[PDB]
């Protein structure tokens, strides 16, 4: 199969750089241009870049000219999105994807990698506090996450066992900072007499909490 | 820079039924040396990549289900639907390649009809840790409703208060086609104290009848 592993994304200050890779396999990589795509907050796609088969040649949106530098290590299968002096409009979630039909000018992009966030932000990076949400047929249990940045925060419940019946909410701002809900609702004789616990993720401050909801 | 206008911003059909999207554009696509137009379709699913639809305007890649049909010329772009399922809910993005800068269109969002569903709604005190820290976030959840106009609101000893709230909605559910929305009265720690009852409340603007939930904090 096509796959393009994305990483690199994070928190930056104003300013500052960022390198994003794109890792492909399952394509003969040497025979296809590659691109990246950015997508701001309010969900609208904005081609970045282009670069040729073997380098030679590069395009950029002129937005970042100067600022973003297209490089593929045609060897290693890999793409990357060197990006400078940073600006907060460049806040977006970035996807690198394959230029097809291998030929001059644009195209259209089959393959898309699943995307990297990038925050540019003077803000310092904040952990969520997890506070459980209990109940004072079904019963709807809930935990809150509260006052965390950058994004993004993964919440699962009971360590993804419980898929079906689960809501996690968008993220609000709230004094500059992010704030979500998950509820999950689970028949009357799973809770309370088992365990239903929370498990939030925030990556950017390296916090990994479980928080079991225990009735009130 | 060819501006592609995707008109309407969002469309609501019922399971079923034929969904039509439009994409404006400012240059003819179509090359007259292959007769080809240079106009794709992509659909994007909350929380995924885009995904490849239809390509040269009207071919469909491979794997998409026949349902999906792309058409037209010029600067006038048609995708259809021919019968929407559940899993359709997604933004669909048109996008030119015809000359360097490729430019996308802002998206149309597919809304799925159904009947009417009262939320369930949910409301949950402080948690202990959260007001040992001095705060108080009441929070109150409307979950699988549908239509999408729904309005909270929160009372505290019977006065309404609208400071400290701060709404969030999901997308529609691919599953039931209903949405859910999540409500926060945000307090302090002496503020939630001071007061007994909690009200939450969704209302609708088409009826009178609300659905009310509430707690007492000493009881």
């Known amino acids: 199969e096509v796959q393009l592993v994305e990483s690199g994304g994070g928190l930056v200050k104003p300013g500052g750089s960022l390198k994003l890779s794109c890792a492909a396999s399952?394509?003969?990589?040497?025979?296809?241009?590659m691109s990246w795509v950015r997508q701001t907050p309010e969900k609208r796609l904005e081609w970045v870049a282009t670069?040729?088969?073997?380098?030679?040649?590069?395009y950029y949106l002129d937005s970042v000219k100067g600022r973003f530098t297209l490089s593929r290590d045609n060897a290693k299968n890999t793409l990357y999105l060197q990006m400078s002096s940073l600006r907060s409009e460049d806040t977006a979630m970035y996807y690198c994807?394959?230029?097809?039909?291998?030929?001059?000018?644009?195209?259209?992009?089959?393959?898309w990698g699943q995307g990297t966030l990038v925050t540019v932000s003077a803000a310092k990076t904040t952990p969520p506090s997890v506070y459980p949400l209990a109940p004072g047929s079904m019963v709807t249990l809930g935990c809150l996450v509260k006052g965390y940045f950058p994004e993004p925060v993964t919440v699962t419940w009971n360590s993804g066992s419980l898929s079906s019946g689960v809501h996690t909410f968008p993220a609000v701002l709230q004094s500059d900072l992010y704030t979500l809900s998950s509820s999950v609702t689970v028949p009357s004789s799973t809770w309370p007499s088992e365990t239903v616990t929370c498990n939030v993720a925030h990556p950017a401050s390296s916090t990994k909490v479980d928080k079991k909801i225990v009735p009130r | 820079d060819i501006v592609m206008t995707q008109s309407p911003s969002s469309l609501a059909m019922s399971v079923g039924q034929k969904v039509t999207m439009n994409c404006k554009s400012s240059?003819?696509?179509?090359?007259?040396?292959?007769?080809?137009?240079?106009l794709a379709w992509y659909q994007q699913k909350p929380g995924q990549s885009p995904k490849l639809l239809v390509y040269?305007?009207?071919t469909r890649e491979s794997g998409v289900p026949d349902r999906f049909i792309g058409s037209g010329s010029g600067t006038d772009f048609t995708l259809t639907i021919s019968s929407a399922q559940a899993e359709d809910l997604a933004d669909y993005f048109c996008?030119?390649?015809?000359?360097?800068?490729?430019?996308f269109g802002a998206g149309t969002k597919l809304e799925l009809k159904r009947a009417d569903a009262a939320p369930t709604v949910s409301i949950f005190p402080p948690s202990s840790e959260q007001l040992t820290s001095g705060g108080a976030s009441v929070v109150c959840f409307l979950n699988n409703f549908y239509p999408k106009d729904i309005n909270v609101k929160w009372k505290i000893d019977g006065s309404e208060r609208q400071n400290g709230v701060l709404n969030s909605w999901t997308d529609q559910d691919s599953k039931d086609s209903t949405y859910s929305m999540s409500s926060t009265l945000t307090l302090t720690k002496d503020e939630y104290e001071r007061h007994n009852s909690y009200t939450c409340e969704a209302t609708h603007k088409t009826s009178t009848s609300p659905i009310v939930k509430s707690f007492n904090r000493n009881e």
């Open positions: 994807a394959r230029r097809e039909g291998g030929q001059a000018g644009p195209a259209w992009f089959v393959y």
């Open positions: 399952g394509f003969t990589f040497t025979r296809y241009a």
């Open positions: 670069i040729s088969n073997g380098g030679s040649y590069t």
């Open positions: 240059q003819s696509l179509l090359n007259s040396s292959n007769q080809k137009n240079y």
């Open positions: 040269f305007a009207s």
């Open positions: 996008q030119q390649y015809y000359s360097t800068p490729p430019t």
